[PDB]
């Protein structure tokens, strides 16, 4: 897998964001995670966390997996990094997302994220409290 550039256009919620990628605006959906919707418990805290991480970053990068790059809604499916730190992992590690939507052939970072979830759970953080 390789990291590619992108620039923040607009925060959306805990697991989607609008980025400019190869010079075109696209909504990206984070691979392998699920955050609570804004109206649900920890939804606003997830959105805030993601928003801050991405807006404060000097450099946003996208990393596609081996399989499908766009979902049925036209959303890019990627791992997103903010100054080299994986946003997908950070949300999970904070108890602000669950590992979810693990489809065969787009699951390179599954076990990394499952490890983060285990530690969040053990700490009783946020959704695991
Ligand atoms: C994260 C992800 C979601 N999706 C689809 C599955 C779900 O379909 P349905 O809309 O039919 O439930 C939906 C979940 O996204 P959200 O959690 O953004 O709603 O997006 C994928 O197809 N591939 C993926 O990797
Ligand atoms: Ca969601």
- Determine the length of the chain: 129
What separation in Å is there between the alpha carbon of 34 and the centre of ligand 2? 5
Instruction: Output the CA–CA distances (angstroms, integers) from residue 120 to 4, 80, 93, 111, 127, in the order listed.
Output: 29, 20, 5, 14, 9
Neighbour tally for 109: CB within 10 Å:
20
**Separation CA 53–CA 124 (nearest Å):** 22
Q: Are 79 and 86 in contact (CB under 8 A)?
A: yes
Give catalytic residues, as residue numbers. Answer: 29, 37, 75
**Separation CA 119–CA 82 (nearest Å):** 21
- Identify which of 71, 98, 102 to mutate to test ligand 1's pocket (most ligand atoms within 8 A of the CB): 71
Structure tokens at 115: 């490890």
Please, which residues have CB within 8 angstroms of residue 90's CB and are 6 or more apart in sequence? 49, 53
Structure tokens at 35: 């955050």
Determine which helix (DSSP H) or strand (DSSP E) holds 56, and give its type and residue range. Answer: helix 43-56
**Separation CA 102–CA 85 (nearest Å):** 21
For the domain spanning 1-129, the CATH number is 2.40.50.90
Q: Are 77 and 34 in contact (CB under 8 A)?
A: no
- Identify which of 101, 103, 110 to mutate to test ligand 1's pocket (most ligand atoms within 8 A of the CB): 101
Q: How far, rounded to the nearest angstrom, does the alpha carbon of residue 67 sit from its chain's CA centroid?
A: 17
Residue 106 DSSP code: S
Domain boundaries, the chain: 1-129
């Amino acid at each position: 897998l390789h990291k590619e550039p992108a620039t923040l256009i607009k925060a959306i919620d805990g697991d989607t964001v609008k980025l400019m990628y190869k010079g075109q605006p696209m909504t990206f959906r984070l691979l392998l995670v699920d955050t609570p919707e804004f109206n649900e418990k920890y939804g606003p805290e997830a959105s805030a966390f993601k928003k801050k991480m991405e807006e404060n970053a000097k450099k946003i990068e996208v990393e596609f997996d081996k399989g499908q790059r766009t979902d049925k809604y036209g959303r890019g499916l990627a791992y997103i990094y903010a100054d080299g730190k994986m946003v997908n992992e950070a949300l999970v590690r904070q108890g602000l997302a669950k590992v979810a939507y693990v489809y065969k052939g787009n699951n390179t970072h599954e076990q990394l994220l499952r490890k983060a979830e285990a530690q969040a759970k053990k700490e009783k953080l946020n959704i695991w409290s």
